[PDB]
Amino acid sequence: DGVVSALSLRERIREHLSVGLLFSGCTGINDKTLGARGGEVIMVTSGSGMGKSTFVRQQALQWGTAMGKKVGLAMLQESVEETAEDLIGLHNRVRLRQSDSLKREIIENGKFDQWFDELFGNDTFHLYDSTDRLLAKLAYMRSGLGCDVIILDHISIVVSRKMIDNLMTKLKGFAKSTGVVLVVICHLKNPDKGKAHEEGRPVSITDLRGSGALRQLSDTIIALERNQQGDMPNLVLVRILKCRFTGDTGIAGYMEYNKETGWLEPSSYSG
Amino acid sequence: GVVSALSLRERIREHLSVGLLFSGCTGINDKTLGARGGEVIMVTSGSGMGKSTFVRQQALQWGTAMGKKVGLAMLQESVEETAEDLIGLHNRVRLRQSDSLKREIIKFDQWFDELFGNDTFHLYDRLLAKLAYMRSGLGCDVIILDHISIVRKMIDNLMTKLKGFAKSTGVVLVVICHLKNPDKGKAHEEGRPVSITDLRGSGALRQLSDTIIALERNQQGDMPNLVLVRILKCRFTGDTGIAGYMEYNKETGWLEPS
Amino acid sequence: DGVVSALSLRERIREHLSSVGLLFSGCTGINDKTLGARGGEVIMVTSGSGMGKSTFVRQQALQWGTAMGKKVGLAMLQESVEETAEDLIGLHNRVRLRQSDSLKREIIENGKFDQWFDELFGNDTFHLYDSETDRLLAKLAYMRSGLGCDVIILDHISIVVSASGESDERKMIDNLMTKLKGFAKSTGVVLVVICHLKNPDKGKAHEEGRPVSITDLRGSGALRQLSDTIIALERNQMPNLVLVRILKCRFTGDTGIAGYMEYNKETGWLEPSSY
Amino acid sequence: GVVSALSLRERIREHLSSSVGLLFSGCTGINDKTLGARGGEVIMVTSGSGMGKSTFVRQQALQWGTAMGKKVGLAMLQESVEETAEDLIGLHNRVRLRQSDSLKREIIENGKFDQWFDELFGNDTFHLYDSTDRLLAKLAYMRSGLGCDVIILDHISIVVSDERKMIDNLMTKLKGFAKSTGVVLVVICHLKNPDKGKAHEEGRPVSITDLRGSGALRQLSDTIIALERNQQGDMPNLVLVRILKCRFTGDTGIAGYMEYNKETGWLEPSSYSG
Amino acid sequence: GVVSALSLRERIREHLSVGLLFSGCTGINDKTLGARGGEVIMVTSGSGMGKSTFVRQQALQWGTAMGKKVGLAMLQESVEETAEDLIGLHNRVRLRQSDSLKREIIENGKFDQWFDELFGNDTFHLYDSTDRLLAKLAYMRSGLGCDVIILDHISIVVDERKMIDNLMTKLKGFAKSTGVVLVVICHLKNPDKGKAHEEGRPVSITDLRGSGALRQLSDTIIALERNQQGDMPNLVLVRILKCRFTGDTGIAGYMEYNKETGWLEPSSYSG
Amino acid sequence: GVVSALSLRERIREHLSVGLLFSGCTGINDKTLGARGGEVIMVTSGSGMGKSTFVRQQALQWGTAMGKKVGLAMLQESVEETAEDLIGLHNRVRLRQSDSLKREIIENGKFDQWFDELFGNDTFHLYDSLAKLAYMRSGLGCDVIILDHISIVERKMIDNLMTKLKGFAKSTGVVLVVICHLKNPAHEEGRPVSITDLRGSGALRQLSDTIIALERNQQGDMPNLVLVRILKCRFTGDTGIAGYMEYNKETGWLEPSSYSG
DNA sequence: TTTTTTTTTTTTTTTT
């Protein structure tokens, strides 16, 4: 029997309480959800063309340089060279992959190796090269590397309803046991009336494909909106949908994109 | 049954002129008349409506004012977290969010032993054998089971087993499950009224229970701290519908009516 | 184990950012925003019915098989191999060969047929295809591996999701699309996809100049999530002034109205307009 | 099976001098921007409920059967076999046969019925079907077995009776039966209910997405012809022909006008200008 | 069984060797030419405008005056009510609206004077209350050998769009190649703006509620209109909406309702 | 299942062996003349405009005054509440609205002076609030059955319910009076309700043999003035105004009036 | 053989 009375728990609470990881850009988030904590499963939601991976790659950068924590990326959507070059271009403030005038410049100038060890000289970042296999690799990332942040790029091609229920229960048990700060990306569904999500429609908590337990086992959900064919396609609206630790949800802040650099930077906007 | 008018003279005379009670929005036990022995109680709402917080408040008010043994089954979190939340709820402090106070109080043992000087509560980290042990060797009068979605026919057999166990013992039992995904319109998190159809797994959950309580609030709205409570079923009374209103009282954490 | 650390990955990046392009034709704004087609992308071209979603594709296939020397493969499933190989001859020779009976017999008589056939198909560049979703991908691999095609065009994806009998069609489109994207990322071939648009709810039709949204892709929601460029064509039947909409650019961020084209009922080329 | 385009020197040649259109009747504005009807060319005809589809297609079947020598097979599902046969006889002899018991009793006693019958069905040009995968099997029995040049189907809404997947599979099968076989295939479908305003039978101009059953009917059809008239208005015999889709040429819009004959049943090209 | 045109040399000659005339108004018979074997006739109006009474009158006229066997399937009311209505409306009275007159006809033995004169030559068949309907109608048309089959209030028989569509397809297939006039009664949906169908709204063809299969499979469509709130609640208007044999639609004529004998007579009111 | 006309030799005479009247306003029996077996009477007004005030009054005048075995199936409340509603309505007092009178009537022995005069001869029946309404007719024998508040009792369900209740009325010899409501707009100011102001679907008016609408202008000059309008009558055809009735606030009753309108 | 969850396409039924 593993039943424990309330009296014989005095030390286990006293040792227990002896904020967490903050966000970068849209500074109303950590003002609202008080940042991520060890043992949380986070969902990032938008449509295609909104820049979910662009948002999460900045968080991968800022939690590996300023915080020094062991950050493990899981780019199931793309290759490791593309995300490595995007990290180099984001840290070095100048857009790398989306320009050809500089790709041949910085390789013959000799400062490629200068930019490489400036950000990968530590043992911080760990990439993944493309269910049971993925979870065994995450267990190796947790044991054999000591990762503190794990980012998972795309969950829909992980499924070739119950296969998402089993996956989300297994991921929640993994984050409960190991206590790793986890970010998991999923997409939105197709609405049947009115505008789509990509033209400035506010996203409700229903809009989760595949199954319905994506909102039942995750600890917080961040959504991003932006009128794509609009008067400005740069201003994003960030919306907290759920928070089990604080509870306060809604519209948090507003960011612009800064097309030369690529940094999601906060913008003042009354309404 | 078909009601005739032959043997119904002395019953109607009773119509002109309970057990454990519920705390907060007091038209619960004014309407369904509290908790009774041998019942199976369901509190089902949307994801994030405060099911666990409401049953945590009721587990507080059924263990101190009544003194009865309270056996929890919090298979969603750990035993220290729900204990810190109960200590902060008794001490009127949002504990697990106030980071400076957590190291300021460590009077910590003073607030611990004040509410745990008895052997009242019994937490938990097969499961029916554990519940039978909590019922026989410990004298529990309230048993709460928070998560049952991972614990059709695989849920129906478990519900038959729980209903037979409750009828055989005679203990107050509260079991929590979630709601299904609505198809058209808004969701339950934006003010949609919950019907008895919306229960995941199967349909025996409404046929083998005794009362169902639902909560609805506008989570993406102006007031995310104003629920509406709805009784959906009560085999003893029958009075269903709107019960009351609770605001969360952010500073403290007590669901208080207004 | 494939958990490659970020420090021991320099050389690969050394052979990555030195060794892109392959510009479109007919319009300039398509090459400004999307910056051409790349090895390993999926470019999707959408329209209504009879709106010219194959004419722009063949006008792009002629420029990418002759003016740049790339080997091009055509999985055309609407049209047989006898018509789409006959439209290209008159297009390069700037006429409408299929829509005219006189010019057909004129190039029969004087012997100009062999001259026009050898000027176009004198180089081993265009590899066609004629017409169950399992053998099509094997034929695409047979085109890419041995023959070595750079731009492969999958015309009319709706036939392999409709003639294939499935109870649930959404998972069929999702699984076909993710296996196709996996093939395109594995072999690194430029891939063009043609799909249709569904029935709208009310109002105008897409064949009457309705401004198309990204959510109107017919069949599933897996079409817009695993494509890298979405380009839409919109006219009003001036039944020849078509506008082009970049609905989703993964690589860059410039989306919106790209440009304007004009179709020629004398030659068959999509010239750019000026408005 | 993949092929290389340098082995195609003998087949593109053979296709180049093989392909000959069948000219429409009733309006010459149809033949100018469609150039007729070819092998492997699914032609859709639609109108409102009872607005003149079967009369038009039966006249087209008469003109393609007795004036151009083309063997024609029909699959009429609305009516009986003897009814459409007597309708063809009465329309070829320029009378109104079935709508008059007096002429039907008149021609059966003086023996001119056999004279009207042998001049049509002497050469054995028409073939009929006696009332869905067995349907295409019998159509291939008609085509590959006998050898008619134009196959007409009517009233496809019986054949599909989740309707959308069924009619999508049916439209793909009919397109595959038309293409790469060598037959013209004529298909008739209906319209759905409108949202607001006036009805399709009261003179509303029909759009392309009004084809009831799916939107998979307008993506696999080559030529789409829509007939529309006002049966309650001042001119209830002035049909308007609207070409909605044309894969071969691309010109869409109003072809012209046709005027139906209240006595002989021959809708003929009128000269009304709006 | 692909049959060529040569094999109909003897069949067409047998097919050349008949419209059943409508009663109540001769304006219907001029632009319909009656009804042949395999001729689906849809009869509609608003709610309570006399769809059952007009079809009951035609069931009377086609049975006792022309010798054609009529098989009714009245589902609005039961068997005894429509039998009393047929007897009272052949004897030109209002039978059910007079308690003393129902009681008198058994005291003087004249009940068999009105039963024998009508129901003796087997010229009628009834039906008491979807594939259990057609299986009995086929027995009504095969073994019994009736000539006009009548179906009342089709909404009892019926997502109710595929159901009414397959029903109308089965009824059309049962009518064709059998040789029977299949009278079918349907209804009309709600109006949207202005006045209602019970106040005399000019009905359109697309108001046949349930599907579009009620206006695309019927050979003849007859609609009735009556302003029961205006000046004359005894003057109905008859509108032919579809005729696949002749091709004339519009106002067929006016019929005057008589509030004494239960009959409606041909009226001569002009607009 | 096929019924010829030869086997109706005596069975039409079997139908010759009668309607059931109405009360309160005499304009109802003038143009409807009652209700036999197989008749459905839809009675409606706005949601809370006094449907049950007239329905239970007719059920009272049919049960204790004309001997007909009235059975209600009130599904808003249980057995005891509507039984005490029948008692307090028959004894002309506002029962469930004042604690003083309910306090005063329980002790002075005027309770069991009221049970044997109404509920003693087992006519009134109720439901334990398909397989039950057949036993309510066969074993019990009650005929005039009322079902209320169909919004708890949105197109397929109401059509299937109305079709099964239509089939329950037919071939039984039973009078099933069903109550429904109106769609939202103002209906509380005397707005003329046509037959199109139903809600749910249009399948209600297709099977309802008789349709009765109730109007009242509770916001004008005299709020206690109501009106009854027949909308659909399949037995006669005469539909329209029954007359005027006046309501009373202190006793809870209504009287037929003849105001000049 | 009997249930539950979930995604995308077309046709008719109703409302502030």
Ligand SMILES: Cc1cn([C@H]2C[C@H](O)[C@@H](COP(=O)(O)OP(=O)(O)OP(=O)(O)O)O2)c(=O)[nH]c1=O
């Ligand atoms: C946030 C943002 C991104 N962008 C551009 C920059 C990048 O080129 C691109 C980033 O979007 P992606 O991150 O590539 O798209 P996604 O991950 O959200 O969607 P999916 O996985 O389904 O394909 O969008 C803008 O133009 N404006 C913006 O505000």
Ligand SMILES: Cc1cn([C@H]2C[C@H](O)[C@@H](COP(=O)(O)OP(=O)(O)OP(=O)(O)O)O2)c(=O)[nH]c1=O
């Ligand atoms: C009711 C309410 C709760 N909250 C907080 C309290 C909790 O921390 C959180 C929601 O209550 P929880 O009880 O934690 O939600 P849950 O247990 O039902 O979630 P799950 O379905 O995954 O089991 O939000 C508010 O902030 N405002 C409110 O009005």
Ligand SMILES: Cc1cn([C@H]2C[C@H](O)[C@@H](COP(=O)(O)OP(=O)(O)OP(=O)(O)O)O2)c(=O)[nH]c1=O
């Ligand atoms: C775009 C365009 C096409 N056309 C003509 C030329 C094209 O050959 C003809 C249609 O040919 P397609 O380009 O093949 O038509 P489509 O691809 O849009 O339709 P489907 O999906 O059925 O294949 O339209 C014009 O006349 N003007 C125009 O602007």
Ligand SMILES: Cc1cn([C@H]2C[C@H](O)[C@@H](COP(=O)(O)OP(=O)(O)OP(=O)(O)O)O2)c(=O)[nH]c1=O
């Ligand atoms: C077009 C037209 C038809 N008519 C009449 C006479 C024709 O025989 C009749 C058309 O009969 P059909 O052509 O057989 O009917 P349809 O194809 O339009 O529709 P459906 O089969 O679905 O019912 O309409 C005219 O009188 N004038 C006209 O201009």
Ligand SMILES: Cc1cn([C@H]2C[C@H](O)[C@@H](COP(=O)(O)OP(=O)(O)OP(=O)(O)O)O2)c(=O)[nH]c1=O
């Ligand atoms: C025909 C007609 C009937 N009436 C009266 C007497 C009829 O019995 C009554 C109509 O009853 P029904 O004929 O039964 O009404 P209905 O069949 O058109 O519609 P539903 O079955 O949906 O109710 O109205 C008139 O007042 N004027 C008339 O012109």
Ligand SMILES: [Mg+2]
């Ligand atoms: Mg992405």
Ligand SMILES: [Mg+2]
């Ligand atoms: Mg919980």
Ligand SMILES: [Mg+2]
């Ligand atoms: Mg095309």
Ligand SMILES: [Mg+2]
């Ligand atoms: Mg026809």
Ligand SMILES: [Mg+2]
């Ligand atoms: Mg009727």
